[PDB]
Amino acid sequence: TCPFYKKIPGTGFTVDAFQYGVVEGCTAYFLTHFHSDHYAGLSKHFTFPVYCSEITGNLLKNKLHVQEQYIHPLPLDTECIVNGVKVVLLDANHCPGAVMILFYLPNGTVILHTGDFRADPSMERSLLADQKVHMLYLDTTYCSPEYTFPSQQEVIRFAINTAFEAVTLNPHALVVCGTYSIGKEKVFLAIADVLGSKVGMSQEKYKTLQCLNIPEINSLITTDMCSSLVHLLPMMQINFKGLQSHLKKCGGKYNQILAFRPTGWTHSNKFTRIADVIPQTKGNISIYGIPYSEHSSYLEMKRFVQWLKPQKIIPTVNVGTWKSRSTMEKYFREWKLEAGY
Numbered sequence: 001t002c003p004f005y006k007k008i009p010g011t012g013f014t015v016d017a018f019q020y021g022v023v024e025g026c027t028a029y030f031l032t033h034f035h036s037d038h039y040a041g042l043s044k045h046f047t048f049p050v051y052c053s054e055i056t057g058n059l060l061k062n063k064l065h066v067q068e069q070y071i072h073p074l075p076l077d078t079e080c081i082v083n084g085v086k087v088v089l090l091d092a093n094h095c096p097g098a099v100m101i102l103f104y105l106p107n108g109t110v111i112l113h114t115g116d117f118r119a120d121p122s123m124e125r126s127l128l129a130d131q132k133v134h135m136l137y138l139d140t141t142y143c144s145p146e147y148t149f150p151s152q153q154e155v156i157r158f159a160i161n162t163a164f165e166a167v168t169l170n171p172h173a174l175v176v177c178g179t180y181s182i183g184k185e186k187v188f189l190a191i192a193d194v195l196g197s198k199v200g201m202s203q204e205k206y207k208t209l210q211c212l213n214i215p216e217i218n219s220l221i222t223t224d225m226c227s228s229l230v231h232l233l234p235m236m237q238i239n240f241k242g243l244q245s246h247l248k249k250c251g252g253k254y255n256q257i258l259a260f261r262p263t264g265w266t267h268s269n270k271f272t273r274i275a276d277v278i279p280q281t282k283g284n285i286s287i288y289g290i291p292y293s294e295h296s297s298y299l300e301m302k303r304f305v306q307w308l309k310p311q312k313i314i315p316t317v318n319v320g321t322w323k324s325r326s327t328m329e330k331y332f333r334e335w336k337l338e339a340g341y
């Protein structure tokens with residue numbers, strides 16, 4: 001049974017609610033982005049209208065085989081009528097194709113559903129500038145002040161400089177980057193660009209990347225692993241055992257691996273600066289954990305909400321414990337008292 005925080009009152013609509021069977025009263029299922037916790041339940045046998053971005057719709061058709069007649073892609077930044085209700089899709093600054101949804105209810109209420117997002121000051125000059133929001137369904141993944149991390153640009157500067165130094169010292173070093181979902185593609189694209197290489201990967205991952213509308217992608221990626229000195233591997237293989245095994249497979253072309261695991265936050269964030277990050281090393285294998293987030297930090301979240309001034313907040317993450325729920329409600333009240341709304 002579908003939880004209340006996935007339902008949009010006064011409509012026939014749900015958000016990210018595909019794992020509950022046929023939801024009573026739902027005439028249109030929205031999907032914010034192609035991450036498995038959110039698409040869970042979709043397949044080629046789904047027969048209700050799915051509303052989403054163009055990029056999400058490419059992934060639903062090619063990767064999950066949803067039939068075309070049920071996929072309804074909408075352009076971004078554009079007023080659209082769906083089943084008699086005005087909606088707008090906005091870029092969420094999450095993974096490729098990820099959106100926030102603005103719903104203009106028939107009674108005058110305006111609702112923003114952030115899906116998963118990384119708040120940014122640029123959102124203060126989107127179509128959100130133009131009117132009031134009564135209800136905010138908020139991605140609260142990192143809603144506590146201990147969650148700090150650097151900008152995505154500082155993290156990519158660290159990765160490029162680290163990889164370029166290592167491979168210039170040793171032209172026989174291989175770079176490996178972990179992946180288990182879409183998102184974070186700048187990590188491996190930026191490193192391959194500094195090295196003058198295409199990124200090598202499995203056929204299944206190449207297929208996924210070909211759905212993402214990235215400009216000039218054919219110039220940047222390949223399935224020919226041997227021609228490439230940046231390889232992508234499943235995240236589970238980014239450990240000393242998995243990397244040793246991979247180095248065997250390259251037929252003595254390489255004699256060193258430098259590997260990256262983009263995680264979200266880890267508690268080494270509460271003590272270490274990005275500049276001071278060091279790898280774990282064993283022999284000719286080194287592994288860096290780099291804090292590349294596609295979710296808001298605490299401070300970015302707080303800035304967004306204090307600017308938007310919603311009348312009510314409904315968290316969509318960390319909702320399963322009473323301690324989490326009470327913590328989040330306390331910070332919402334602080335923010336509202338400090339700003340005066």
Ligand code: NI
Nearest residue numbers: 033035094116
């Ligand atoms: Ni996500």
